[PDB]
Amino acid sequence: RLLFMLVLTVAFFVAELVSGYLGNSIALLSDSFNMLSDLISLCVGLSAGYIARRPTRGFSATYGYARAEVVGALSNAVFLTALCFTIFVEAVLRLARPERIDDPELVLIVGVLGLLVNVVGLLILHVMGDALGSVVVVITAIIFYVLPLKSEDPCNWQCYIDPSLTVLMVIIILSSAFPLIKETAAILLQMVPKGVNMEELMSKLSAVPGISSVHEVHIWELVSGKIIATLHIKYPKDRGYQDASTKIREIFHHAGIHNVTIQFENVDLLLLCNSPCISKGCAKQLCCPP
């Protein structure tokens, strides 16, 4: 992997952040915020790589720190959403009170260099967002460069180009952050992964021969590819559960789930959980209360 992306990205985030206030460009500020999200993503990726190749799986994190990638992805998406909210609010203000670019040359140089940085990053919608933001910065600087606006003269149409394009790229960036927010939240909400079709899976689980009932089916995803399926199963007392275990495990394997914990409970009250918490008062803090 490449780690020089982190130092370059943080230095360039600082550069765009300084030049955006120095040049009075929201598009440069929006691109600086987008590269801030990019460097947060790089830090999250390095954290995931460090968690891998050196697992801990101790007494504090039972599953491990694999969920760090998803938590960091959701946090980065929410961070970028708040930054885009601030950028959109500022752009709406400048759509009412327009402002000039103080140093069009500085903004042009920083935007061109940011476009080059994003190009080399892609070389080594979500991905094209940074490139389009740098293109927007370059266009805004060029308009103030090819057709200069005198300081004494009031704001012409040129002052509205930056807020409009910045609003457009706020929309573009949000159109990528929102699906990411939805996916990472769905993973973190302990929801069934999109690949797993639960209806057919429960149909097959019920169709498994020699099994009385199936309850407390809890299928959730730790990370991409790690699907955990907790499951309680009621079986006739006289018969065993070795064949049932094999069939349920192969069904889950064919459904893409390899982490299957089956609790077998001996057998209209014969459908409830035979092994809840040892007290009747535990029914409050029991998922799927009986």
Added chain:
Amino acid sequence: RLLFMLVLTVAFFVAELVSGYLGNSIALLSDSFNMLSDLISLCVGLSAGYIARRPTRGFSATYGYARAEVVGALSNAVFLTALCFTIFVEAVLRLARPERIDDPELVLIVGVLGLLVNVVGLLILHVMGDALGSVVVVITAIIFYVLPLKSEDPCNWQCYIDPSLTVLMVIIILSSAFPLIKETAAILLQMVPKGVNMEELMSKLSAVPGISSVHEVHIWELVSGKIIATLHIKYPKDRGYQDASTKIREIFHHAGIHNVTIQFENVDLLLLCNSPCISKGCAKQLCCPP
């Protein structure tokens, strides 16, 4: 419960966002962002209240949407952290280039009314942060009121009071968001809840009579009070596991865990999981792989 806090809070968020931008006050802007986080928290609380007393727990969310409170808490904390990052960056910018307050009267009125809004919200460290943010806005407005500053006159010490206090309250707000970020991330990372002392719990689990081995102990917290403990247990084949099940469940009950799924596996190599995925290639996906 009362939901008029939502409409009042959103209206006042709009009011402070407009007034701080019209009055050029970061402290008013910081308080508007803090009340935006407050209304996000109110929306999260309403979502949690709707999830309760009306559960769904269907084929999409096995554990339900109870984790929505934690996901919304982390999202709100990250949103507020990004807003505070923007506020701190702006304040540092004004710490270099000071600015006047355009309409001190408007900022004074909005800050006083925001303090009243916080007071009435109390009537019906985050609280100290919000109250002190309103007090900071009020103080900044008063300073520009008792000693009015003419536009012709350059910025005196008065122009640096707003950025300094705003930086201070960015620190204060972050000192509350960061513990919340840590706690909600720990919950969402599938980490052992703080109350559960895993060392003693595994000691007792091993000390349980009639049990050969214990592996795949996965203790995580869905929400406050809902602790889920998946667990694989190896037991001697000749002996049963009814007494072992009772003892393990009562141990988990005394440790504060009521959702316990125990998989009992019949018995050097007699310590590995007897029921991995049906294929040897599944070991790359085995969470906690042997």
